[PDB]
Amino acid sequence: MEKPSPLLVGREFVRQYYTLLNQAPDMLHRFYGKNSSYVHADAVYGQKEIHRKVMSQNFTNCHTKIRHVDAHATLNDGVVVQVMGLLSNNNQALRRFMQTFVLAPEVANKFYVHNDIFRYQDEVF
């Protein structure tokens, strides 16, 4: 109990991530570093290339409803997060999705996104 709970870290990151996704997706890049991987399909790496991928997807009035968040301590003082929720982009029907994050220490209890893996359900089943 010498650091905030992984659940607090994970849940507040998810809050800020999907808020930024709706309000300024061109700012999402601040979460990523050199080693970061973004999957949303083939992976892209690094802030510049991740930013380019994010802006390619045209997140327009993206609205998210989080239905559950699991967040646990993982190796090397990281936090692994699994998000289940619904997402509406461009005012279309909400679609169920998975999102897996691995948060790595960036500082004092500060984290950056090392892995970001998103997948819609309907595309899979």
Place this chain on the structure above:
Amino acid sequence: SMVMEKPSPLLVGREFVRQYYTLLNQAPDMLHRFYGKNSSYVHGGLDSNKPADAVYGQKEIHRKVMSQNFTNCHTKIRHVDAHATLNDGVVVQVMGLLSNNNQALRRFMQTFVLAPFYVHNDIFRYQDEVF
């Protein structure tokens, strides 16, 4: 003597997923041997309230695995994506259908974290209990 590139995270993750769900069908009593101290595990479920809480450590994990009464558990994996992560570990995302005790197939969303098999984290949720 020899030099060969390490296997891709996707090859490692896909083989782990195969072994995991093979053991879940054949001998769930040995699933716990993937986990160690400070491993986390949850497999869907609801409380009397709400999604059930995770447990930690091989021995509680074993007891929770046995609590699920995995019997004739059949799984069809529809999506697996694995990537290198911290300390050359592997993070694996899985979506598929699981039928336990000859019941109807249920969709699920799962995340694993594997050591650089050692499972650091096993996060499994049924979609029907969450959505």
